[PDB]
A paper describes a structure:
However, not all mutations in MYOC cause glaucoma, and common variants are expected to be neutral polymorphisms. Among the common features associated with pathogenic myocilin misfolding, we demonstrate that a single metric, OLF thermal stability, can robustly segregate benign from early-onset disease variants.
Previous support for the V329M variant as benign comes primarily from the observation that methionine is the corresponding residue in Danio rerio myocilin, but the mutation has also been documented among glaucoma patients, including one diagnosed with juvenile OAG. Assessment of spent media from cells expressing each of the 16 full-length myocilin variants revealed WT-like secretion for T256M, R296H, L303I, S313F, V329M, S331L, T353I, A445V, V449I and K500R. In addition to the five variants that we predicted initially to be benign (T293K, T353I, K398R, A445V and K500R), our study reveals seven more (T256M, R296H, L303I, V329M, S331L, E352K and V499I) that are indistinguishable from WT OLF across multiple assays. Thus, our data indicate these should also be considered benign.
Residue numbers in the entry: 244 to 502
The structure:
């Protein structure tokens, strides 16, 4: 049931980090879960600092919300920023101080693929407006895996590419007119890129859309609340049909409605 985004609900807090290491981070579920995981499995990465390698895994939502991890994975190289996603059994993340995306299969703890995103800025060239080295943002939608970035040729405007999830080859690329550094974050729903106007405001908006199927850009005014005033991560999960976000220690989720 695809369509255009028309409404975002109030943020619901599912878990709050207890230390500064989790001021910013990424949490996520796999929209294409594979053995030994299920649609309830949740992963959490607290991303403050310079040697981020611990991935917390929770078999059950109850454990994610109230308990300790059921397993901790140690990544084979440090991860950069908050843009990572889970897809079909693999964590897709950016290597620290690089433009390299790594496909890391959690059940075997093996690197299955690596790819330098051609021309992508990294390490503070084209971050979102809050900084945080957020130059490269992976995304999953109804059609699969994407990457959101920019390049010198695009003059800092958001570029998005569809990725082959097995080998990380770029399959198609689109260039928007939206300055990446001017928006707080972005995500993709049903092939349309959406941006958020501010990471601090209780009265932010989903403010731009770019439809990859038609090439048309639009402005929007859909209200979006940053309840804790510092949103470092905003992604869409196409299985739950919800936004997942990280806001100033808090792992939150927003309902949505599509036309
Ligand atoms: Ca995002
Ligand atoms: Na992401």
């Amino acid at each position: 049931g695809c369509g255009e985004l028309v409404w975002v609900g109030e943020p619901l807090t599912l878990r709050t980090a207890e230390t500064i290491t989790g001021k910013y981070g990424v949490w996520m579920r796999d929209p294409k879960p594979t053995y030994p995981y299920t649609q309830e499995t949740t992963w959490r990465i607290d991303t403050v600092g310079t040697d981020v390698r611990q991935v917390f895994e929770y078999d059950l939502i109850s454990q994610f919300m109230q308990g300790y991890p059921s397993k901790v994975h140690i990544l084979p190289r440090p991860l950069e920023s908050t843009g990572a996603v889970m897809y079909s059994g693999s964590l897709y993340f950016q290597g620290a101080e690089s433009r390299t995306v790594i496909r890391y299969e959690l059940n075997t703890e093996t690197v299955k693929a690596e790819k330098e995103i051609p021309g992508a800025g990294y390490h503070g060239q084209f971050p979102y407006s809050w900084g945080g080295y957020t130059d490269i943002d992976l995304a999953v939608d109804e059609a699969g895996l994407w990457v959101i970035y920019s390049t010198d040729e695009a003059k800092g405007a958001i570029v998005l590419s569809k990725l082959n999830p097995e080998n990380l080859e770029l399959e198609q690329t689109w260039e928007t007119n939206i300055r990446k550094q001017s928006v707080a974050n972005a995500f993709i729903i049903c092939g349309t890129l959406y941006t958020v106007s501010s990471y601090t405001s209780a009265d932010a908006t989903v403010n731009f859309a770019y439809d990859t199927g038609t090439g048309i850009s639009k402005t929007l005014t859909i209200p979006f609340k940053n309840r804790y005033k510092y949103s470092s991560m905003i992604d869409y999960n196409p299985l739950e049909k919800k936004l997942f976000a990280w806001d100033n220690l808090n792992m939150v989720t927003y309902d949505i409605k599509l036309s």
